[PDB]
């Protein structure tokens, strides 16, 4: 539970950093709706999980970069889901 459970860490770091950077990246862009920390976080979680609702997303270029970083380091990082392979015990 150390090799996997450790990923949960990385995930929470990404989710967090992603929210901050996203808001940072998106503000100043007319129409951007990804401009407040809280939902900025709701977004990152729905991006990492890739649930994909489409209720929030980036419009700027860096916003999309932060996005891609979150998706990659996030879909990967969701190796936490595999970590819950302990339900096979």
């Amino acid at each position, epitope marked *: 539970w150390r090799a996997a459970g450790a990923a949960t860490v990385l995930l929470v770091i990404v989710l967090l950093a992603g929210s*901050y950077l996203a*808001v*940072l990246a*998106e*503000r*100043g*862009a*007319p*129409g*951007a*709706q990804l*401009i*407040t*920390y*809280p939902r900025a976080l709701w977004w990152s979680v729905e991006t990492a999980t890739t649930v994909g609702y489409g209720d929030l997303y980036p419009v700027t270029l860096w916003g999309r970069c932060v996005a891609v970083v979150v998706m990659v380091a996030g879909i990967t990082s969701f190796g936490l889901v595999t970590a819950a392979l302990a339900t096979w015990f």
Partner: antibody, heavy 118, light 108 residues
Framework: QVQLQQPGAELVKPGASVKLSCKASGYTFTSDWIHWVKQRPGHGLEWIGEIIPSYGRANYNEKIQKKATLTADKSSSTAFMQLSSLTSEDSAVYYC???????????WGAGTTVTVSS | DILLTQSPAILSVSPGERVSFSCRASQSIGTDIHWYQQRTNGSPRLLIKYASESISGIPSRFSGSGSGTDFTLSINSVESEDIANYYCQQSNRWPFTFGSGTKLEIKR
């Protein structure tokens, strides 16, 4: 205790420029945004721009003509708005406010009355 | 950018009565609307945030309602201390915007 301290007044001659201030106190985070709002006598509030001191980035209202340049100073917890080449039009009260990145302005400054006259 | 329509501009109510100021968005903004009070020569003062959420230090006389594009700030039993200018402000889409304003006016 009072959280945002703004100089009550500032006189300026047309074409000249003044650098307003706003010193903070109380709780501070890296998620804090300091905004500036212009208000001419009689009329309502007008967002001018915003800045994130814990990074330094600032965005400005694109509808109005840009007459300002925001800056901050982490240590002294002071935000500075530089208004350049002023005219009668620029005379008004300017408030600075603190926004916790959640969208609303919880606390505001007393505002600095600014007059552009000879 | 989002437009906040505040009409009527002036509201005339009798003491103790209930008063309602309305703010309409040019587009659906969920509940990202916030209310401020500003008395003659004072600075703005957060009254209600996120349309309904209360604020400490504010009379329970004050309340909010609405979602999308139609919002209402209410006062139960107005009174002299309530005479001011009320503004609505949104944080749904950048850049934040303000309502034109609505002056309360008590008739005694």
């Amino acid at each position: 205790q009072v959280q945002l301290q703004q100089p009550g007044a500032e006189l300026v001659k047309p074409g000249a420029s003044v650098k307003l201030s706003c010193k903070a106190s109380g709780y501070t985070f890296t998620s804090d945004w300091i905004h500036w709002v212009k208000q001419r006598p009689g009329h309502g509030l007008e967002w001018i721009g915003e800045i994130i001191p814990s990074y330094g980035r600032a965005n400005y209202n694109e509808k109005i003509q840009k007459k300002a340049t925001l800056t901050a100073d982490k240590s002294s917890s002071t935000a500075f708005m530089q208004l350049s080449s002023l005219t009668s039009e620029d005379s008004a009260v300017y408030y600075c406010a603190r926004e916790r990145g959640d969208g609303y302005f919880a606390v505001w400054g007393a505002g600095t009355t600014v007059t552009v006259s000879s | 950018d989002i437009l906040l329509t505040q009409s009527p501009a002036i509201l005339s109510v009798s003491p103790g009565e209930r008063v309602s100021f309305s703010c309409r968005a040019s587009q659906s903004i969920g509940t990202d609307i916030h209310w401020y009070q500003q008395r003659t020569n004072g600075s703005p003062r957060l009254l209600i945030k996120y349309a309904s959420e209360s604020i400490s230090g504010i009379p329970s006389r004050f309340s909010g309602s609405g979602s999308g594009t139609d919002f209402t700030l209410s006062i139960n039993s107005v009174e002299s201390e309530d005479i001011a200018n009320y503004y609505c402000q949104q944080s749904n889409r950048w850049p934040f915007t303000f309502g034109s304003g609505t002056k309360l006016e008590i008739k005694r």
